[PDB]
Write a protein that binds this DNA or RNA. Structure first.
Lengths: 129, 129, 129, 129, 129, 129
RNA sequence: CAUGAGGAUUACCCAUG
RNA sequence: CAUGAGGAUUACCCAUG
RNA sequence: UGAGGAUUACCCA
RNA sequence: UGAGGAUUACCCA
C-alpha cells in the first residue's frame, strides 16, 4: 500500500477536474499540489501528532486559489487574485478503535453532503437561519 | 429559505443512521445535536462573521462520541477519553461569488471523499506513508 | 420545529388569559412579553449556558406585574404598581439523558400542582407548617 | 390547616409515582424526601422570610437524581454527575393579596405546563431555537 | 416563531428583486446580507437597547452598493464603486402600547410613500423647494 | 412647481389620517407640522447638505406624540404625554444617477414594508429573534 | 503544551493559562 | 467560575472561596 | 446632544 | 465616527 497518492480534489465530472498530487513530505508534513505554477496551485497539507499523552491530532489545510494574470513592471505573470483557506484540526482519543474512527469520517462526510445545511449556506454566501 | 433544519450526520443507509437536529440558536451560533445525553451526543455548531476587512470566516465544530464499549446513558470519565473534536475554520475573501463558493464546497467534499488519502488515514488510525 | 413560540403564561379558561410571545433573542437570552406597554408587560426570559466542564445551567426569570395608572406631572401613564419576581436556576449534569430530563420536568410540574403544599402556602400568604 | 404533608412529586399515573414525604423541619425550613438513600433521593425544601421592608421571599430548592444506569443503593461518584439541582427564588411585594398570589402561582404553572417552550427545551437537552 | 428571516429589500416586480438574508446575530446586532460577493452585497443591521430608564432605542442601518468591476494590473475583482449609507435611530418610551407602536410604524411608512415630498426629493437628487 | 407641500404622514383609511403641512423653511431646514395645538402636533423636518467633497447628506426627523391632557391646579392644557423620535441620515455619493437614487428609495420603502422583519419588531414592542 | 465563533502575508503570528 | 433560606431599581449588585 | 465627517456597529467637539 | 444620552436642528467622549 501507501496512502500518499494523488486524488481528485474538485470533481467536475472528468472535465476541468482539479486533481492534486503528492509533492513533498519534508518535516512530517504531507503535501499535495495541482499541476500549476507554485503561485497558482491548489494546495493540501496534512500532519498527525501525538498532541497529548492520550490524544492524537490531525492538522489538515486546503488552499483554493482564484487564478488570474497580473501585469507587474509591464510584464504578465501567472498569479492568484486571492486564496480561500480551510484549516481543520481533529483530535481523537487514543482509545478510539478503527470502527470509532470510521464513525468520525462518516460524520465529516455527512456534514458536507450536497443539500445539507452547512454546505448550502456556504455556497449561498449566507449564514444559518 | 430557512436552512436550519435537521439532517443525517452519519449515514448507514436507513438503518442505524444518526440524525442531528436543531437544538440552540443563542448568539447566531446554530447548534444541532443527536438524541442522546449531552455527554454522549453528536454535536454540530456553525457560525459566520467578517473576520477582517477582506475576509469572512465560517467556524464549524463537530463532536463525535467514542462508541466502542460505550454504556448508553452512563457516566463515562474522563470525558477526554470518550470524545473526538473536529474544529474547522473556513476563510473566504469577500470577492468570492456564489460560484466560487460552490467550488470551495466541492473541494471540501473531494478532500473527504471515500477512498481518498486523508479519510483513509484517519479511519485506519494512521498518518501518511 | 423551533420551540421559540408563544404560550399561555396565565390560564383563566380562554378569557383574560395572559398569553406571552417571543420578543427578543439578543445576546442568547430568549425573551417573551405580553401585549402591553413595555412598562406593564409580563416578561419571561430564558438562557442556557455550559456553566462547567460537566454541567449545563438554565436560567429562567418571570416578571408578574400589578398594573396601574399613575398621574405624573398631572398626566396619566400606564405603569406597574409593583412587580413580583421569579428567578430559577437549574443545573443538569451532562450525563443526563432525555429520559432523565423528562424526570426533572415532571418533578417541577408536580411541585407546583394545585393542592400540593408549596403552591398552597404561596397562594395563602403563609409558610409551611 | 397544616400543609406540611406528603405529596406526589413525579406523577406517572399510579404506577412508578414518586412520593416525597416530610423529613425535617429544623429552622422553619420544611424538607421532604423520597424513600431512598440521601445520595439518590428526591429532595425538596422550602422557606419564607421578609427579604426586605417591601418584599417577602420564598426559597424553594429541589434535587433530582439521575436515574439512567443508576445502581439502587450503590455508591455513585462523583456526586455532581448524578444529580440535578433546582433553585427557585420567588419575591413577592408585601402589597400582594391572596388573589395576586394565586395569579403568581398560575403563572408558574403555565410556565412549566406540558408542551410549552421552557419545559420542552429542558426535556430535550436543548436551548431555545 | 422567528422574525430573523430572509426578506425583500428592493422590490422590482418579481425579477431583479434584491433579497437580503440572515448572516449574523452577534452581540445583539442582527445582520442581513444579499447573496453573491460580500463586496457587492446589500447590508442591513438592526438592534434594540434600553437607552435610558424610560426609553428603548432601535438602531437600523442599510447599505446600498453601486455594483462595479475593479481592474488593476489586469486583475479584475467584483467590488462596489461606492455605497449609499442609510442610518436611523428610533426612540420609543416604555409607555407605548402596541397600538402606539403601530402608529409610529405607519408614520415611517407614510414618510416614505411614493409621491410624498421626501422620497421624491431623494429620488430626484434634489432637496426641498 | 414645488414639493414643499402638505402630505399624509399617517394613513388610516380616509379618516383619522394625520396630515402634516408646511410651516417653516428657515436656514435650509424644511419643517412640517400637523394642525391644532403645536404642543400635540406631529413634526417632520428635512435638510440636505454637501457633507464632503463626494457626499450629499439628507437629515430627516419625525416626532410622533402621545396626545394627552395635563391637569395642574385644576387648569388643563393640551400636551403630549411623551414623544417618539425618529432620526435618520442618508448619505449619497455625487456619482449617483437618478436611477441609483430611485433604487435607494425602494430600499428604504422595502425595509419598512408591512410584514418585513423590522417594521414587525417595532410594531410589537420587540427586537429581533 | 493548553484555550480563543483570536488574525493572517497561511506549516506561521497574537492573547490568555 | 464557585457558594449564600445574600439584596434589588431585576440579564444586574454584594460577601465569601 | 450635534441639518457633526466617514473606509460605516467606527471616530471627532 | 459612536447598537453614545436626550426636554430633539441641542449636548457629551
Amino acid at each position: 500500500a501507501s496512502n500518499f497518492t494523488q486524488f481528485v480534489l474538485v470533481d467536475n465530472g472528468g472535465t476541468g477536474d482539479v486533481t492534486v498530487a503528492p509533492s513533498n513530505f519534508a518535516n512530517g508534513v504531507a503535501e499535495w499540489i495541482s499541476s500549476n505554477s507554485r503561485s497558482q496551485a491548489y494546495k493540501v497539507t496534512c500532519s498527525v501528532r501525538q498532541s497529548s499523552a492520550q490524544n492524537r491530532k490531525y492538522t489538515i489545510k486546503v488552499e483554493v486559489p482564484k487564478v488570474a494574470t497580473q501585469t507587474v513592471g509591464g510584464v504578465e505573470l501567472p498569479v492568484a487574485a486571492w486564496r480561500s483557506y480551510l484549516n481543520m484540526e481533529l483530535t481523537i482519543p487514543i482509545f478510539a478503535t478503527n470502527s470509532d474512527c470510521e464513525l468520525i469520517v462518516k460524520a465529516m462526510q455527512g456534514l458536507l453532503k450536497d443539500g445539507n445545511p452547512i454546505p448550502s449556506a456556504i455556497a449561498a454566501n449566507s449564514g444559518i437561519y
